[PDB]
């Protein structure tokens, strides 16, 4: 029921008197909770929307030099003072080169040459800063019970479902109560302030590649750093690190810009988690929250409904779904309406004793049609056994 098919699915059994249960709301995991008087509800924190991520100091990812020139003075003939050397848009490097009688100077010695060029960053990766009031974790809850095989993955429609529904928990709204129809109301007490280190990380974007890099790694990137939202002439903080003015043996200081650092940024982005960006709300699909499951409002729906009449036909007979739980897919052939599936899993058929606990406890057929497809779930002991679906 959207949580039993998870390979990292967590089975929750037993709470603190049914009032508060402490759970780990993982960004990639889903936890199925089974209670004494409540159905098994799978909660999966699948959505993670980061909204209003303000820009940070973003280094240049591929720069390039402009029209460069050199100002040369002789040895003891003054230092180089370029006219573009006083221009902030042109990066320049001064050096002591050889100037001689054959080199044009009036004395053989070390003249001064300064080479300048309009070093402009052709593209820069920009790291958005995520505030703590921008996170919103979307957790889908789904009561395991009266649903078919096409509702385990068929998540199209959560408000009009009444068996599954998604609730968004934010830092402003940590406490919530999702009214699951028939089952009562599941109480979410997730701590959005206690997040998975949202203030220690930045969301760097480069080539449409969202990456939740660390704050120290984002503040340690050695690129030409545009400061803020100044989208015009960038400041280029550490802009001199992209070019190298290699002086020759004579008066030729060739300023060569470095290559594209997006490959080295991908090489440094291996240890970070790649995040998605859905516009203003960046979609981070990983994390780990801490949820207070309120099972006081959670009731067992259809408990007063009687057992089904007959014609429980196990179509698509299931097996262990990677955890020992046996997903029973049945077709209730009968017009009992709100009937209850009287199924049992036991080895000894001459005794008829209960053999194992059921995942989808209280299996109740909901449809009033002739053949109603439903999915049940049971967890028997280690080995194989007999599954009697119905009486006779």
């Amino acid at each position, epitope marked *: 029921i959207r949580c039993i098919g998870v390979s990292n699915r967590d089975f929750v059994e037993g709470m603190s008197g049914g009032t508060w249960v402490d759970v780990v709301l993982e960004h990639g995991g889903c936890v199925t909770v089974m209670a004494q008087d409540k159905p098994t509800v799978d909660i999966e924190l699948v959505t993670t929307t980061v909204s209003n991520m303000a820009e940070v100091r973003s280094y240049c990812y591929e720069a390039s030099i402009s029209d460069m020139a050199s100002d040369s003075r002789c040895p003891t003939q003054g230092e180089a003072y370029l006219d573009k050397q006083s221009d902030t848009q042109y990066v320049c490097k001064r050096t002591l080169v050889d100037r001689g009688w054959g080199n044009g100077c009036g004395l053989f010695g070390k003249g001064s040459l300064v080479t300048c060029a309009k070093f*402009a960053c052709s593209k820069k990766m920009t790291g958005k800063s995520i505030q703590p009031e921008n996170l919103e974790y979307r957790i889908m809850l789904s009561v395991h019970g009266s649903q078919h095989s096409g509702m385990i993955v068929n998540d199209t429609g959560h408000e009009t479902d009444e068996n599954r529904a998604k609730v968004e928990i934010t830092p402003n709204s940590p406490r919530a109560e999702a009214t699951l129809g028939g089952f009562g109301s599941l109480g979410l007490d997730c701590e959005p302030r206690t997040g998975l280190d949202f203030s220690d990380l930045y969301y760097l974007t480069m080539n449409n590649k969202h990456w939740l890099v660390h704050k120290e790694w984002f503040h340690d990137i050695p690129l030409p750093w545009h400061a803020g*939202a100044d989208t015009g002439t960038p400041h280029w903080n550490n802009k001199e690190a992209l070019v190298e003015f290699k002086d020759a043996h004579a008066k030729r200081q060739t300023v060569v810009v470095l290559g594209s650092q997006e490959g080295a940024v991908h090489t440094a982005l291996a240890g970070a988690l790649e995040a998605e960006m859905d516009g*203003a*709300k960046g979609r981070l699909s990983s994390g780990h929250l801490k949820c207070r499951l309120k099972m006081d409002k959670l009731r067992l729906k259809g408990v007063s409904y009687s057992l089904c009449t007959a014609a429980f036909t196990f179509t698509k007979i299931p097996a262990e779904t990677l955890h020992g739980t046996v997903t029973v897919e049945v077709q209730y052939a009968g017009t009992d309406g709100p009937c209850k599936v009287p199924a049992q899993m036991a080895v000894d058929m001459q005794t008829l004793t209960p053999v194992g606990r059921l995942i989808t406890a209280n299996p109740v057929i909901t449809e009033s049609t002739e053949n109603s497809k439903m999915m049940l779930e049971l967890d028997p002991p280690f080995g194989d056994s007999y599954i009697v679906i119905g009486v006779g």
Partner: antibody
Amino acid sequence: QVQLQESGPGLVKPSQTLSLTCAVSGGSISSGDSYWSWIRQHPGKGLEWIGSIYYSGSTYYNPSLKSRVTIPIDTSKNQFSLKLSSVTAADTAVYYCARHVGDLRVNDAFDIWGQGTMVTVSS
Amino acid sequence: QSVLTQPPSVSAAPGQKVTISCSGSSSNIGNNFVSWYQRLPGTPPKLLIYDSDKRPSGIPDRFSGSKSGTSATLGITGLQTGDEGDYYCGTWDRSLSVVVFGGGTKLTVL
């Protein structure tokens, strides 16, 4: 790959306000190297830039189209807008919504082009 | 005054190198480096050349840019029928304060 697709009402009335929407694939308006520029490309004339919005939403445009052009941006939708109120025959042209040059590019650098939504302004 | 004088007629032999000259001014073409937009009949212009020398990623090696004064030069060495299109120069004007595209280059690889 980042792609831009300009679309909208290609036929407009005189004195009307044309609205072209540039949808973006492979990126968003809040990117680290994004500045979505709309350029008017009339038939028989070269491309002339009319509005260039930034990641913050506001931007600078041409002064000839300053009295009629607007550069809207959809932050939640990841789309750009080129609006022309009180249009005429001279305002009808190709309206591509390319993503502009990077950070140190104080001059323009139209590396990526939009879908090229042609505009017709007739009564 | 936002006009770039470009050669509007472009032909191309099989493997022939074509030359397109986009003439600007000292304020825009002489002021900075101008790129080109190569457009199809149903497509808008895509970037070829940046700063008048640095070709974009994915651009062909036969496309070669050059800058001399206010004149940008686009050479197409080994030009084919796929080199045909609308190659129009473009540059930002220091006096204009905005980017202006040129007159175009109707390349026709016959």
